[PDB]
Amino acid sequence: AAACERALQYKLGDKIHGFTVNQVTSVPELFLTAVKLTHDDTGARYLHLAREDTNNLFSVQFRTTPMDSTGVPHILEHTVLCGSQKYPCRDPFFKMLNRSLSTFMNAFTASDYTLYPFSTQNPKDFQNLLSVYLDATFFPCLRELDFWQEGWRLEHENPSDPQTPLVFKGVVFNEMKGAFTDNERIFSQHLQNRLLPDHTYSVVSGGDPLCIPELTWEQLKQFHATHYHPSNARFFTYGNFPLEQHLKQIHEEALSKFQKIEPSTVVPAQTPWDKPREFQITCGPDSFATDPSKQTTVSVSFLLPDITDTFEAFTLSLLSSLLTSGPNSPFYKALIESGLGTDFSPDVGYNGYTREAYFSVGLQGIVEKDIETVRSLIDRTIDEVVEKGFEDDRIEALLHKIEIQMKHQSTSFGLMLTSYIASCWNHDGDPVELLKLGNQLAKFRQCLQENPKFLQEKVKQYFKNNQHKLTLSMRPDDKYHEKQAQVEATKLKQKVEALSPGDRQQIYEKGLELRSQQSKPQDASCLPALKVSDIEPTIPVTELDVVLTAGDIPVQYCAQPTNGMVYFRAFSSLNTLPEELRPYVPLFCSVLTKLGCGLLDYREQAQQIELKTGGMSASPHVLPDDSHMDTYEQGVLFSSLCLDRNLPDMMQLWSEIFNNPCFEEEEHFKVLVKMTAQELANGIPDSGHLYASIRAGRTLTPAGDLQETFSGMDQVRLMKRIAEMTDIKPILRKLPRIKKHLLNGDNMRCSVNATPQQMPQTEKAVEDFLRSIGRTFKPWQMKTHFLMPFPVNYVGECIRTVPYTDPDHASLKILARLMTAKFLHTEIREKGGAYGGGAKLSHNGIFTLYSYRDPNTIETLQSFGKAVDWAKSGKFTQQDIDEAKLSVFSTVDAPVAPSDKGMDHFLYGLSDEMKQAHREQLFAVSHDKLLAVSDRYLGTGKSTHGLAILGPENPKIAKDPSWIIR
């Protein structure tokens, strides 16, 4: 009845559709049985992980070893998703994204391999996506004009005017422009290139913008014919679906059409250096920093063995975690608390993506005069670790942390396994040996108990006696990007001058045909698709029981197969808090569990947290009510995790944090605030559309204003202001004031997710913890421009609509997904040139339009206006509504892990009755209701708009009196 029981029936030497069973291993700590097959005729390798998890995942892996910095596997990865032989239609990937019930569908290109994974829960959907993926990777139409669109091409500044000069355009070209505006990517790339300068790791695999136009269409076709051959492929599947169906599809669709080749693609070993080296590089000065003399980053890197010998890599990874993770690590005490820098260097710790892994440590944010100081600190610190070793409590904490990651149940487990074995498997390693974590832990414990200086000899061998050291420093130059502009313009002129007028007319005519390709709406009916009849009408009910305890705290217990894990959550309201202290509540949540409690200093507190729990965190949440736009819930979520046996210790930790938090530890507090502020400044681009949509919605609902206070740009500006204060004491006095309003049991509710066998002891520990603790808005329009020194823009427009329980809400959600799939995607992405762009509908009722990395600004809002006119126009078919329903049900029915089932009832108070009502409204939504809601809410002048833009200077915006610039 189970998956691993039938999977254990595969005997060695069995022939199944051209494959041969080579190895079957039971992995009891992961509740799975691994099966390794190879195709006899082609030599393709297959690893199947059978586990009773309904979220089945497929992935295929190709070894791509580039020998130049042209970016050929990255552009080829983009090009294979544009069309294949059996499905000649345009863009099969994104079209199947709206014709499937997938939960994830993407592709990855690492430094030396490319990986194409997908996951879904429906077996027919699995067969459909498997056919589209096999066909996309192995038989693409590799049309040259698609290569001109996705890769690089010459194009006029106005594509219709052949007398303006030609400039470079391309998707990957601007991807690499954005790769080398990032200082961290320059540092990481140059570090990897300098440490392994012999072979494929010495080049920029993503593409050097000055070396990208050397790639021709014929070179791309040869690269595809050489590397995307099934003899150079690794196939991987995970889940409970029958293996035989997969093998029948793989054989009958792809592998039968090829014959055996011998890939000459093995990456040779790096020859060890005789002497350490130093290199100096330069980057672009960051504008978020305020001091220019404190912008130097320095690192020291060590070469470690190969990933093939699994054991030694596991050992050195544990050693690297012991050396750099947490305030009890030697390097934290030596570097962070020295006050020389601001944070660790990039790629800090163990980096096992290359063939030979490497260790890195260093600082960023130092003054250039302190480079030799840092190098001496690292040398002296290594000497102290050699002489003193590690204490046993930290080793136990590390082994307990790895045990927790082994037992924890995620929703994307198969994705974690394929990413965790891809690197070892890529270099002819045994992927099954990485799965047996219990065996390696046992051997590690034995190796420590037999030799007390085991870790001391390992740090000695790989740090004190390893001559393969790389010291690399990076300091910015104020004129770097003008040099960059000069060299790209020089290659531009060098390539444009050699073109004849007939060549230029060929470029112009291809440009007009390309623009038509980007404009003409095409048919995608040759792709397979699911119907609404395959969507389940009702969901299985989730069982809860609320027990009032001690003497009025509601506690929600949900029996779940969590595999010996207990997840405890508590949510405390903020309704009694004075309004002056609201903006410092994220800071309060971010430092509360890191400063010490009772008789424990911050080092001992961090040791206890890492030794007993899986992590304890606090974060502010604003939970809107579902039936009133002007009603909301504000609060703080305390969340923790522990193994079954360490539960009373965890609740004792929570009691000590609730009754005696250490608000007097000032030195470590200054470190934490400067680190949090630096992290917030580094994360602006990846969440730029999030910050823009949150700013645009501040003036529409009270909940929006509070969400801007807790997590908007206000929080970043506040964190920077606090991080620039020289005297931190007036900020530190605010923390007891918040503590006396939050850490009590007056307005509290709790949740527990655990196995039913553990439940009475858990009920006792929580009931023991609860006894141990103390006892009309009118929206108005606003336009905001953050003048940011960015090369791309982030635009957000918010529209006020109905809440969740309103019958029009489900129709609005369908309309939002419809507009995203059939208008905004083509216009903003293909035509506009943005990396991401669409429309979303939130639970509170804010209809948000967003753009991500958009080179335009005014045209984006104008395309939003043309999009709402399109939605009112009704120019969409019934099949488009079917695709929108499919995508929405692909989103709302995404799998939930045992640790958050059910979280919606605990946080937002939506019952199963409410979810079923909204599900039947999503079923009953029709074309006329979509027209009705489009003319009632999204139309111009019917509701209040809000706009916000993060991006570079726009002179026309500066002359607009209706805009406020911040």
Numbering used by the authors: 31 to 805, 847 to 1037
Paper text:
Presequence protease (PreP), a 117 kDa mitochondrial M16C metalloprotease vital for mitochondrial proteostasis, degrades presequence peptides cleaved off from nuclear-encoded proteins and other aggregation-prone peptides, such as amyloid β (Aβ). Of the Aβ-degrading proteases, PreP belongs to the chamber-containing protease (crypt-containing peptidase, or cryptidase) family that uses a sizable catalytic chamber to engulf, unfold, and degrade their substrates. PreP-N and PreP-C, in the closed state of PreP, form an enclosed catalytic chamber to entrap and degrade monomeric amyloidogenic peptides, thereby preventing the formation of toxic aggregates. Comparison of the five cryoEM structures derived from the apo- and substrate-bound PreP reveals three key conformational states based on the degree of opening of the catalytic chamber: open (O), partially open (either pO1 or pO2), and partially closed (pC).
